[PDB]
Chains A and B, each alone.
With several copies, the nearest count.
Chain A
């Protein structure tokens, strides 16, 4: 049950915390604010044919 993970800290400058769940419902758990994955392609590059930045946009 013990769940150890690193905590937020600074850059190039122990950092671990323990967590345990006490309730039988997943909705009772604390916020999972440790995820930092992102991908802006869905909104920035929605075109069908791949476009190379160096090459001209058209022709």
Chain B
């Protein structure tokens, strides 16, 4: 046998109910117990038999978090006077982009594999003389785990990666893609950390303390045109094989810092004319 046939679940159906007159009171309960009532419409009114074929397939965490989302973008020039402006250096983190940040912060602990995709585009900077002929460009993406050497210029020796993984990509082809496993020292990623760094309750406070994922560096391999050219890189993350624990309420206030929970007080919700107004 060279083939294995690994080879679903619909919502609950509604059962028929007739008139009732008894001492049982399903409608009456007590929320003080912290228990959410499990009543169904069949307990309060007469209902017909209905077979439901709806499924909750699209509400699973795997599908909810299984969408690529932008997490960072930066620009770097092929040639310029400032050395720091010819390459990018980004400390990896998921708190930069608001949509993905809020999506992730609905759970306290996460454990998943990651799929990273890079989108790179280039454009010629405005200027008087734009007449030039330049072959196709090539880019290098370098990942440096924590503690490794960091390049200080575009043509530094550190770009000769011998152990650090890297990707060389040429313009005009499909976007680069790659997978990365679960690389946390702990048993799961923590979106929130209520604690300090030092043992005497001092120093850094918050999730910043647990961010030790490394850095990413990007440069033009050898392109140096007579006239400046600007390139932009976009990083997309896509969790795979996800698991989550301890859900928490979604955030209500707008984000204001990339490494803190600071916020400004916000009203609970919008207002209306009065408690009885029901019209538009």
Asked whether A4 lies within 8 Å of B7 as measured between CB atoms, the reply is yes
* A2, B57: Cα distance in complex, Å: 25
State A33–B113 Cα separation when bound (angstroms): 14
Neighbour of B57 across the interface among A32, A36, A46, CB < 8 A: A36
Please state if B6 and A36 are interface contacts (CB–CB under 8 Å): no
Report the interface size for chain B: residues with CB under 8 A from the other chain.
39
Q: Mark B176-196, 1 if CB is under 8 A from A, else 0.
A: 000111100000000000000
Within 8 Å by CB of B24, from A12, A35, A37, A55, lies A55
Contact between B179 and A53 (Cβ–Cβ < 8 Å)?
A: no
* Cβ-based interface call for B273 (8 A): no
**B126 → A minimal CB distance (Å):** 43
Contact B66 A31, beta carbon cutoff 8 Å: yes
Do residues A25 and B181 form an inter-chain contact, with CB atoms below 8 A?
A: yes
B: which residues have CB within 8 A of A? Answer: 2-10, 24-26, 28-30, 33-39, 43, 53, 55-57, 60, 62-63, 66, 113, 179-182, 240-241, 247
The number of residue pairs between A and B whose CB atoms lie closer than 8 Å in the complex comes to 92
* Known interface pairs A11-B53, A28-B179, A33-B66; A56-B25 also in contact (CB < 8 Å): yes
Known: A8-B57, A36-B60. A57 touches B24 (CB 8 A): no
Among A8, A36, A51, A55, which residue has its beta carbon within 8 angstroms of that of B9?
A36
Contacts of A35 in B (CB 8 A): 60, 62
Whether A14 pairs with B4 at a CB distance below 8 angstroms is: yes
Complex partner residue of A27 from B10, B39, B181, B247, CB under 8 angstroms: B181
Question: Using a CB–CB distance below 8 Å, which chain A residues touch chain B?
Answer: 1-6, 8, 11-12, 14, 16, 18, 25, 27-28, 30-33, 35-38, 43-47, 51, 53-58
B57 touches A4 (CB 8 A): no
- Partner of A57 from the list B9, B28, B179 (CB cut-off 8 Å) is B28
B49 to chain A, nearest CB (A): 16
Q: Which of A6, A25, A56 contacts B7 (CB 8 A)?
A: A6
Q: Which of A1, A27, A53 contacts B26 (CB 8 A)?
A: A53
Report how far A11 CA is from B8 CA in the complex, Å.
Answer: 10
Q: Which residue of A lies closest to B7 (CB)?
A: A5
Contacts of B181 in A (CB 8 A): 25, 27
Whole-angstrom distance between the alpha carbons of A31 and B179 in the complex?
A: 12
Tell me if B7 and A31 are in contact (CB < 8 A). Answer: no
Which single member of B9, B39, B241 contacts A32 (CB below 8 Å)?
A: B241
Q: Are B179 and A27 in touch, CB under 8 angstroms?
A: yes
**Chain B: minimal CB distance from A51 (Å):** 6
Contact indicator B56/A31 (Cβ below 8 Å): no
